Amino acid sequence: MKEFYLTVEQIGDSIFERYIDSNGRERTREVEYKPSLFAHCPESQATKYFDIYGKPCTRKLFANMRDASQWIKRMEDIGLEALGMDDFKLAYLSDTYNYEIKYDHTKIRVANFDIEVTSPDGFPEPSQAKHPIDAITHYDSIDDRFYVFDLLNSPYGNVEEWSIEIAAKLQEQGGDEVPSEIIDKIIYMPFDNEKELLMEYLNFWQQKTPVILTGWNVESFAIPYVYNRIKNIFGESTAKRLSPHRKTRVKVIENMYGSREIITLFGISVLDYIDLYKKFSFTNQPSYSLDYISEFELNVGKLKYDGPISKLRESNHQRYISYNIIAVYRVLQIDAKRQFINLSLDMGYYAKIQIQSVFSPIKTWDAIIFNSLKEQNKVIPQGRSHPVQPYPGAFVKEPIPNRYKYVMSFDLTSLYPSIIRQVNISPETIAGTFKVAPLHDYINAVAERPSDVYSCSPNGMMYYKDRDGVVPTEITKVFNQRKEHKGYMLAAQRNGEIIKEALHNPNLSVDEPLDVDYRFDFSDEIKEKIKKLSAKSLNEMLFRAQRTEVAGMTAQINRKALINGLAGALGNVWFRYYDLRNATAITTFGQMALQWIERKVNEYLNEVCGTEGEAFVLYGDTDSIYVSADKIIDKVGESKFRDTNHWVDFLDKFARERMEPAIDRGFREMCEYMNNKQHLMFMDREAIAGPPLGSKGIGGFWTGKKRYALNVWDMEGTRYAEPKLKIMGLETQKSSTPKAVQKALKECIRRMLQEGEESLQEYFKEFEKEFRQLNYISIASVSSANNIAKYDVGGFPGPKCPFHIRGILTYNRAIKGNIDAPQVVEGEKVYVLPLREGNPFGDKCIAWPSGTEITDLIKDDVLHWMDYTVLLEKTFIKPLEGFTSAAKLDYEKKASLFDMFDF
DNA sequence: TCGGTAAGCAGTCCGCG
DNA sequence: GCGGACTGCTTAC
Numbered sequence: 001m002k003e004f005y006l007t008v009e010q011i012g013d014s015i016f017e018r019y020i021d022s023n024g025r026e027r028t029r030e031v032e033y034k035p036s037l038f039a040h041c042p043e044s045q046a047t048k049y050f051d052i053y054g055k056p057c058t059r060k061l062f063a064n065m066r067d068a069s070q071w072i073k074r075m076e077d078i079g080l081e082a083l084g085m086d087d088f089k090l091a092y093l094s095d096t097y098n099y100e101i102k103y104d105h106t107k108i109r110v111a112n113f114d115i116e117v118t119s120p121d122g123f124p125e126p127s128q129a130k131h132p133i134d135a136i137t138h139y140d141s142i143d144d145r146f147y148v149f150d151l152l153n154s155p156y157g158n159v160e161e162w163s164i165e166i167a168a169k170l171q172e173q174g175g176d177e178v179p180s181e182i183i184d185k186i187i188y189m190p191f192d193n194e195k196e197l198l199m200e201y202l203n204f205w206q207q208k209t210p211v212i213l214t215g216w217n218v219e220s221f222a223i224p225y226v227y228n229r230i231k232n233i234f235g236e237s238t239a240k241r242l243s244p245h246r247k248t249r250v251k252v253i254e255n256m257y258g259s260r261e262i263i264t265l266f267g268i269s270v271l272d273y274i275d276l277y278k279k280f281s282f283t284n285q286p287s288y289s290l291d292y293i294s295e296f297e298l299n300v301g302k303l304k305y306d307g308p309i310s311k312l313r314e315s316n317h318q319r320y321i322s323y324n325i326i327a328v329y330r331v332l333q334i335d336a337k338r339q340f341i342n343l344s345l346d347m348g349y350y351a352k353i354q355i356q357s358v359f360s361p362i363k364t365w366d367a368i369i370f371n372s373l374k375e376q377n378k379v380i381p382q383g384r385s386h387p388v389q390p391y392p393g394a395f396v397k398e399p400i401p402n403r404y405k406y407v408m409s410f411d412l413t414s415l416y417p418s419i420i421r422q423v424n425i426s427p428e429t430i431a432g433t434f435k436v437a438p439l440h441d442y443i444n445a446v447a448e449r450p451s452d453v454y455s456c457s458p459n460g461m462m463y464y465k466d467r468d469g470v471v472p473t474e475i476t477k478v479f480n481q482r483k484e485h486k487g488y489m490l491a492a493q494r495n496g497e498i499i500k501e502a503l504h505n506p507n508l509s510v511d512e513p514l515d516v517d518y519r520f521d522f523s524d525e526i527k528e529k530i531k532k533l534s535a536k537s538l539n540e541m542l543f544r545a546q547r548t549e550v551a552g553m554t555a556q557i558n559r560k561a562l563i564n565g566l567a568g569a570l571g572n573v574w575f576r577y578y579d580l581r582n583a584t585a586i587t588t589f590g591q592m593a594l595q596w597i598e599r600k601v602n603e604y605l606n607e608v609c610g611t612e613g614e615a616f617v618l619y620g621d622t623d624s625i626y627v628s629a630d631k632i633i634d635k636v637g638e639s640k641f642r643d644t645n646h647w648v649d650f651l652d653k654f655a656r657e658r659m660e661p662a663i664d665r666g667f668r669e670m671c672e673y674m675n676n677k678q679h680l681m682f683m684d685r686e687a688i689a690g691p692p693l694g695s696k697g698i699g700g701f702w703t704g705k706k707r708y709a710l711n712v713w714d715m716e717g718t719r720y721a722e723p724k725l726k727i728m729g730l731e732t733q734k735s736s737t738p739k740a741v742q743k744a745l746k747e748c749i750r751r752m753l754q755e756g757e758e759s760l761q762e763y764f765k766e767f768e769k770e771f772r773q774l775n776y777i778s779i780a781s782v783s784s785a786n787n788i789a790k791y792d793v794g795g796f797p798g799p800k801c802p803f804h805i806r807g808i809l810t811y812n813r814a815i816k817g818n819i820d821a822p823q824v825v826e827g828e829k830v831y832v833l834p835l836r837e838g839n840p841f842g843d844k845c846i847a848w849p850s851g852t853e854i855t856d857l858i859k860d861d862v863l864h865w866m867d868y869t870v871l872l873e874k875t876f877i878k879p880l881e882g883f884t885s886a887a888k889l890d891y892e893k894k895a896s897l898f899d900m901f902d903f
Numbered sequence: 904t905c906g907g908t909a910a911g912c913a914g915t916c917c918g919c920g
Numbered sequence: 921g922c923g924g925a926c927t928g929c930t931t932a933c
């Protein structure tokens with residue numbers, strides 16, 4: 001097999017590399033790497049090295065990395081550019097792996113772990129590590145085993161051994177319901193003292209040294225706790241055994257309630273699953289407890305136990321250990337679904353970076369571009385200092401707030417990367433400038449053609465048409481991968497709907513799910529077999545289709561994110577290829593494209609409808625247009641349609657056969673106007689929206705920019721079994737909105753769009769009547785808690801103190817003296833509830849760590865003093881008022897002359 | 904050696920016979 | 921008690 005790296009580190013003048021060799025064995029080597037950098041030289045000198053602008057360079061081979069770094073400093077002081085890769089481990093990887101890396105994930109040791117620490121005096125701070133570690137579960141991907149280290153004797157209680165037999169039993173039978181599929185993979189190791197537990201764990205760690213280290217919150221809790229606990233008991237040198245190179249870095253944040261620290265373990269790639277989830281999931285959650293996320297992702301119930309966690313080991317050691325095990329497994333279950341570790345590996349090896357650098361689009365792109373240029377013997381420019389400067393972005397149309405009955409939307413494929421490719425935007429493809437006209441003049445095609453030689457953007461930039469740019473070249477490769485995966489995702493989505501349709505008429509038979517690849521549209525023969533399947537097999541197929549869809553979603557959305565990241569990186573001052581000429585060349589072109597095609601679509605639809613000057617495009621954001629299809633439906637006459645699906649089919653055909661060709665013609669003209677390298681403005685139909693035929697539903701509404709709701713029957717070629725609400729920006733979509741309020745608002749919207757005003761009024765009346773009976777957590781608002789200390793004046797709110805922070809300060813005063821009360825953590829999220837006047841908390845609101853029940857000593861007071869009236873008005877009534885006023889509907893029947901009668 | 908902009912709404916402070 | 925200038929938070933691209 002071909003070799004591939006596992007980890008790489010620079011330590012002084014040494015590169016330390018862990019890798020897999022040709023025989024598939026894990027090896028480690030220390031290399032006294034001799035790096036090269038480059039200086040511009042005169043033209044009279046024969047060289048094979050050229051910078052990206054074709055200027056000749058001389059290579060400087062250094063005896064060591066420090067010598068190379070020192071030369072950079074001298075060059076800075078002289079005032080001359082020091083070219084080449086200054087992150088020497090990237091140069092090392094590029095030199096050692098001068099080919100496309102084919103990695104074998106089965107040879108990579110992925111460790112998932114978590115620890116337990118009983119603490120009778122508050123949260124066990126990792127920086128202090130004053131309490132015994134009393135459990136570790138460490139899962140090894142190579143062994144496929146859960147190694148459980150269980151402390152039996154501790155100053156906080158002596159306990160009996162954990163029982164695997166009781167662990168496997170149902171909870172309803174007194175067991176812990178440790179999943180059956182992992183029972184046989186558990187290796188249980190009890191210890192009579194912590195010193196032997198930890199010594200054994202370190203020996204274990206030496207034998208099975210993680211390459212990828214993950215788990216939930218491991219970076220901020222498990223890792224620094226283990227490191228500091230070992231340091232306190234055995235000494236710092238022993239703690240450093242957690243690094244295969246015996247080197248660590250301790251970073252102390254300290255601000256300001258307690259000192260926290262992050263430990264860098266050289267030779268390990270830590271990918272805290274919490275950080276992977278936040279980067280790659282595209283959710284915003286009200287809480288990031290593992291219980292919350294596991295319920296969201298897997299539909300598994302909370303791990304239930306009696307009493308506080310500080311007393312769980314002593315009261316129920318059996319459950320304590322089982323829950324430690326299940327917690328580790330839950331992260332594995334989330335990854336089996338989401339496939340973020342797979343993504344990280346794919347991306348890391350593609351770029352040739354440390355795997356943990358996937359968190360940085362700048363590092364990733366620097367490495368991709370460096371490797372690309374190096375293959376051509378080109379020399380990368382030195383990074384330079386730039387002041388931060390605001391610059392213009394996308395255009396968003398101001399919509400007329402209203403109900404909109406029939407809507408069809410259209411959207412440009414991968415816009416910013418497509419602009420890069422179309423215009424040929426790269427640091428080295430700049431040909432010059434032209435004198436700009438007002439943007440409106442380009443949009444309306446009245447401005448002079450910028451150039452008949454070069455490829456242009458309406459920001460004034462010109463690019464070479466007849467040469468390749470490294471940015472377009474490399475962005476295209478990732479775009480093409482993205483496109484492949486999005487194809488698989490959409491096919492799986494379409495296949496899902498086929499299964500949902502079949503589930504309306506399931507067969508009474510004993511059968512099996514079909515052996516199919518869900519990444520491809522089902523053949524006619526598969527569809528025939530599906531119509532004969534039982535409910536049991538159909539539901540299993542639907543699960544597999546949806547898992548396939550999620551896998552494709554992960555793969556495509558994050559490749560989309562990486563390429564959009566490159567467009568944004570051009571506007572980040574720390575990017576090697578920072579250039580506002582290129583950043584604004586993209587965004588300005590986008591503004592033109594949207595407004596150009598708005599004009600073209602209005603022109604076209606007026607023409608085919610036999611009218612002039614009507615506004616068909618009601619809204620657009622960045623690269624999308626929303627077209628009112630009322631006149632199109634009315635042109636043929638609504639009475640001509642047999643059912644909803646009939647008019648949906650008609651609009652689908654209209655969009656594809658008439659509008660898209662006109663849109664294509666419009667953009668081809670824009671391309672020749674800007675004299676661009678390649679036409680890549682591909683704007684396809686996205687949503688077909690409207691009310692069910694014959695209903696009083698309003699179809700859709702806009703309240704303003706970035707705020708709308710649509711009843712969608714078809715999305716990007718997926719014809720839904722059941723209509724789906726597309727809601728953007730409204731409170732239903734915000735993590736700050738109470739859970740039960742999100743639900744009620746969405747149903748209010750569903751009724752508006754699908755059923756009409758009377759239906760809405762019926763639901764509103766019920767919700768208002770029952771509101772006070774909802775669980776307090778379901779009706780609590782959520783906020784991130786930033787800069788708490790800033791507004792903390794003797795436990796009381798200082799000037800301009802935000803509402804949620806005031807809630808936290810109220811909570812802090814309420815729990816003073818309480819030892820078991822959970823502290824609010826700076827930067828994390830809190831539930832917030834308003835309090836009625838005269839409450840014993842002494843303020844208008846209270847806030848507590850999100851995803852948790854509020855502590856028992858103040859729970860009864862909060863429930864007694866909760867302001868339901870304020871809660872309902874602020875979170876439910878006020879947003880609903882916004883929706884209905886925009887839609888010209890009432891959520892409450894207004895008084896009229898009819899009230900004089902007895903109906 | 905760490906490494907995108909546009910834009911809506913809730914809330915505080917302030918003016919306000 | 922509301923509107924206006926400002927911070928903060930959050931979402932749509």
Ligand SMILES: Nc1ncnc2c1ncn2[C@H]1C[C@H](O)[C@@H](COP(=O)(O)OP(=O)(O)OP(=O)(O)O)O1
Nearest residue numbers: 411412413414415416417560564565568622623933
């Ligand atoms: N998360 C983001 N980071 C940076 N730029 C973004 C992001 N989301 C959107 N943009 C910018 C760049 C996009 O090309 C442009 C249009 O957004 P959008 O339509 O969501 O995606 P897209 O056009 O890149 O891909 P798609 O093919 O899925 O439509 O807005």
Ligand SMILES: [Ca+2]
Nearest residue numbers: 115116324327
């Ligand atoms: Ca735990």
Ligand SMILES: [Ca+2]
Nearest residue numbers: 411412413414
């Ligand atoms: Ca798009």
Ligand SMILES: [Ca+2]
Nearest residue numbers: 505507531532
């Ligand atoms: Ca059937």
Ligand SMILES: [Ca+2]
Nearest residue numbers: 411412623624
């Ligand atoms: Ca879009």
